[PDB]
C-alpha cells in the first residue's frame, strides 16, 4: 500500500450515477465552466461564456447562496411539484431524469427563493437595528 | 500637527519589506489587478485579464475564503514543506523568497484545501438536518 498511484474519474463520468453519489463531485464540473473574423468569433464565444458564468453567479448570490456549492434554503417543498419521497430520489434516480421531471416547476421556485431572501435581509436589518 | 499633508507608499514598493510588514497593505496590490488588428489585440488582452481575475476569484471561493483578503483555514501545516519557525518567517524573510522556497509544494496544498472545504460543507449540512 505504498508507492502505488491513483487516478480518479473525469469530467462527466458521474452522469449515470445516482443523485447522492454524483453530488459528491460537484467541483469537477464547476471548475470546467471557466476554462481576423475567426478571432471575432472566438472573442464572442469567450465573452458569451463569461456572461453566462456571471449570470449564474449573480443568480446564486441573489438567493443568499453566494460562494457555496451546496446551500440549503428556507423555502418549503410543495408536494404538487413532486410526490416522490427521499428513498426514490437520492438512491434510484439520476440528475438528468430529475431535470426532465421538474422542468416545468422552476421559475416559481426561483421567485420564492428571491422573496424569501429579501424577507430574511429585511428581518436581519430590523434585528440589527436594536 | 495641523496643515501638513501625508502621502503613502502605493504599488509594489513594499516588496522588499518583510512578510509581516508586506501583509499589511494587501489592498493596494489587490485593487490594481482589474484596472483594426490592434483593437483585436487590446480586446484579447482585456478579456485575458478579466478571465484571470475570474479564475482567481473562483479558486478563492472554492476554498471558502470568498470575499476575504486574509482567510486562515483548518488544514494543518506539514513539517515536510518547511521547518522554519514563525520567528524566521514573518520577520526575516520576504514574500518573493518564500514563494521561491515553497514553489514545489503548492498543488497538494490546494487539493487539501478543496477537500477540507468539501468535508466542512458536508458536515455543516449534516448538522443542519437535526
Amino acid at each position: 500500500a505504498v508507492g502505488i498511484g491513483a487516478v480518479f474519474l473525469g469530467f462527466l463520468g458521474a452522469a449515470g450515477s445516482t443523485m447522492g453519489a454524483a453530488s459528491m463531485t460537484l467541483t469537477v464540473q464547476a471548475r470546467n465552466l471557466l476554462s481576423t473574423v475567426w478571432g471575432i468569433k472566438q472573442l464572442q464565444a469567450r465573452v458569451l461564456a463569461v456572461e453566462r458564468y456571471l449570470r449564474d453567479q449573480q443568480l446564486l448570490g441573489i438567493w443568499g447562496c453566494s460562494g457555496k456549492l451546496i446551500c440549503c434554503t428556507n423555502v418549503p417543498w410543495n408536494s404538487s411539484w413532486s410526490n416522490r419521497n427521499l428513498s426514490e430520489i437520492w438512491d434510484n434516480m439520476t440528475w438528468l431524469q430529475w431535470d426532465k421531471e421538474i422542468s416545468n416547476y422552476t421559475q416559481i421556485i426561483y421567485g420564492l427563493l428571491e422573496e424569501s431572501q429579501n424577507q430574511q435581509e429585511k428581518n436581519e436589518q430590523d434585528l440589527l437595528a436594536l | 500637527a495641523v496643515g501638513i499633508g501625508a502621502v503613502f507608499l502605493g504599488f509594489l514598493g513594499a516588496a522588499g519589506s518583510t512578510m509581516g510588514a508586506a501583509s499589511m497593505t494587501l489592498t493596494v496590490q489587490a485593487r490594481n489587478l482589474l484596472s483594426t488588428v490592434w483593437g483585436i489585440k487590446q480586446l484579447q488582452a482585456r478579456v485575458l485579464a478579466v478571465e484571470r481575475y475570474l479564475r482567481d476569484q473562483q479558486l478563492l471561493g472554492i476554498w471558502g475564503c470568498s470575499g476575504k483578503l486574509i482567510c486562515c483555514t483548518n488544514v494543518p501545516w506539514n513539517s515536510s514543506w518547511s521547518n522554519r519557525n514563525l520567528s524566521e518567517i514573518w520577520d526575516n524573510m520576504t514574500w518573493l523568497q518564500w514563494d521561491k522556497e515553497i514553489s514545489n509544494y503548492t498543488q497538494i496544498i490546494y487539493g487539501l484545501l478543496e477537500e477540507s472545504q468539501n468535508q466542512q460543507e458536508k458536515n455543516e449540512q449534516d448538522l443542519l438536518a437535526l
Epitope: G5, V7, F8, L9, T25 | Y105, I108
Partner: nanobody, 127 residues
Framework: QVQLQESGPGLVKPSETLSLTCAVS?????????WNWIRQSPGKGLEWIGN????????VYNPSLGSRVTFSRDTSKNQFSLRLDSVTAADTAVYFC???????????????????WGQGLLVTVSA
C-alpha cells in the same frame, strides 16, 4: 494505450556514472504516478532500484544501493532519467522502467488496475 521505452548507453566503465532515460507515451508524467526502476541480473533476479513521484518529485531509493541512485523527471519531454554513480561489475543487468496504479472513483469503489513493465535495455559494465 500506454507504452514505455528506455534509452541510454549500453556499455559503461567501472566507477563511472550510468545514465538511463525512460520515455512514456499515452499518458503524462505530471499526474499522480510513481515511476519505478527495476533491474534483472543472472542469479539475483528482479531487483528494485527506486522510484520517483511525478507530481511532487518525491524520490525513494533502495537502501542497498545507498546514495548511488538519483532520479530526475522532465515534463516537457515526458521522460524520467535514472542515474547510478560508481557503477561496478555487479550492475550488469537488464533495466526496466515500470509504473503501477489503480483507476477508481472519488470516495467509492475501484474500477481497474494497471501495470505496463516496458521493454527495458541490457547494460554491461566494463572498461
Amino acid at each position: 494505450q500506454v507504452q514505455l521505452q528506455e534509452s541510454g548507453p549500453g556499455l559503461v566503465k567501472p566507477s563511472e556514472t550510468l545514465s538511463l532515460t525512460c520515455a512514456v507515451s499515452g499518458v503524462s508524467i505530471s499526474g499522480n504516478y510513481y515511476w519505478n526502476w527495476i533491474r534483472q541480473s543472472p542469479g539475483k533476479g528482479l531487483e528494485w532500484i527506486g522510484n520517483i513521484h511525478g507530481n511532487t518529485a518525491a524520490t525513494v531509493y533502495n537502501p542497498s544501493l545507498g546514495s548511488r541512485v538519483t532520479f530526475s523527471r522532465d515534463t516537457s519531454k515526458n521522460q524520467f532519467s535514472l542515474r547510478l554513480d560508481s557503477v561496478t561489475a555487479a550492475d550488469t543487468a537488464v533495466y526496466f522502467c515500470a509504473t503501477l496504479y489503480e483507476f477508481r472513483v472519488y470516495m467509492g469503489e475501484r474500477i481497474s488496475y494497471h501495470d505496463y513493465w516496458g521493454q527495458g535495455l541490457l547494460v554491461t559494465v566494463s572498461a
